[PDB]
Design an enzyme around this catalytic site. Structure first.
Site, mmCIF file in Angstrom:
data_model
loop_
_atom_site.group_PDB
_atom_site.id
_atom_site.type_symbol
_atom_site.label_atom_id
_atom_site.label_comp_id
_atom_site.label_asym_id
_atom_site.label_seq_id
_atom_site.Cartn_x
_atom_site.Cartn_y
_atom_site.Cartn_z
ATOM 1 N N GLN A 19 47.058 77.222 20.038
ATOM 2 C CA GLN A 19 46.957 76.805 21.242
ATOM 3 C C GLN A 19 46.139 76.944 22.286
ATOM 4 O O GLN A 19 46.099 76.451 23.565
ATOM 5 C CB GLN A 19 48.544 77.237 21.708
ATOM 6 C CG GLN A 19 48.436 78.803 22.105
ATOM 7 C CD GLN A 19 49.949 79.426 22.433
ATOM 8 O OE1 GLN A 19 50.478 79.715 21.354
ATOM 9 N NE2 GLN A 19 50.111 79.440 23.771
ATOM 10 N N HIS A 159 57.302 84.447 23.946
ATOM 11 C CA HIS A 159 56.385 83.674 23.173
ATOM 12 C C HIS A 159 57.302 83.158 21.868
ATOM 13 O O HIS A 159 57.985 83.693 21.332
ATOM 14 C CB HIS A 159 55.486 84.732 22.533
ATOM 15 C CG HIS A 159 54.263 83.918 21.744
ATOM 16 N ND1 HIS A 159 53.403 82.877 22.127
ATOM 17 C CD2 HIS A 159 53.970 83.960 20.465
ATOM 18 C CE1 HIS A 159 52.622 82.709 21.300
ATOM 19 N NE2 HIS A 159 52.970 83.106 20.112
#
Ligand SMILES: *[C@@H](C(=O)O)[C@H](O)C(=O)N[C@@H](CC(C)C)C(=O)NCCC(C)C
Length: 212
Positions: A19, A159
């Site tokens: 990411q 997360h």
């Protein structure tokens, strides 16, 4: 449910992604579950678009974080494009779904796993990959390079990742930090500790797509 589950062995998990600096974990996590459920239901493994969720989910905050639930809700309401059609740029842009032609896949809904319950999460993983959250801010998680992880970590989840399997003493997690982190991009997090939060808060908030 069986002792071992690993959706990679069933051809239902695509390669590990990175990411980057963008806070798009919520979109990566949601996409793993979509790739899984489409394979389970249709027999075909495809990659789907994190960028589209990043750009188009008005309930989330782009590279400043977001919600696996609202990403999965968006795919159930509209659909999602292939990753190739709408690839990852690492920065939020305008929603380009309509320019990029018809959606490639669509789901029917979203369901939550009973929270703070190890067995409920294992049950859901035995059926499909599941979006889960954990506390990744600690240096021990940041520096993880292999083995069955027990922390140190707290339960301050921050997360989103995807649970794609489990075994006798761990849950198998696909992370979105590239293949250089963990075990080729994966972490095996210890289970069975009796902590209702899960190690690093792993049982806090778990969702999966529904596809009839
Ligand atoms: C995760 C990443 O590492 O990219 C990303 O920062 C993120 O989406 N975090 C969310 C919390 C997780 C538990 C999914 C987040 O911060 N979401 C913002 C919405 C709430 C106001 C916390």
């Amino acid at each position: 449910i069986p002792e071992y589950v690993d959706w990679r062995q069933k051809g239902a998990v695509t390669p590990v992604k990175n990411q980057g600096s963008c806070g798009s974990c919520w979109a990566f996590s949601a996409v793993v579950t979509i790739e899984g459920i489409i394979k389970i239901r249709t027999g075909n493994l495809n990659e789907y678009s994190e960028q589209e969720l990043l750009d188009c989910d008005r309930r989330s905050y782009g590279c400043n974080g977001g919600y696996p639930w609202s990403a999965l809700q968006l795919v159930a309401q509209y659909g999602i494009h292939y990753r190739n059609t709408y690839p990852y740029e690492g920065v939020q842009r305008y929603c380009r779904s309509r320019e990029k032609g018809p959606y490639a896949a669509k789901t029917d809904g979203v369901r939550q796993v009973q929270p703070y319950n190890e067995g409920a999460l294992l049950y859901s993983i035995a059926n499909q990959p599941v979006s889960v959250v954990l506390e990744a801010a600690g240096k021990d998680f940041q520096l993880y390079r292999g083995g069955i992880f027990v922390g140190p970590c707290g339960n301050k989840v921050d997360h989103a990742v995807a649970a794609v399997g489990y075994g006798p003493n761990y849950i198998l997690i696909k992370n979105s930090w590239g293949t250089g982190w963990g075990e080729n991009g994966y972490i095996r997090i210890k289970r069975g500790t009796g902590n209702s939060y899960g190690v690093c808060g792993l049982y806090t908030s778990s969702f999966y797509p529904v596809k009839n």
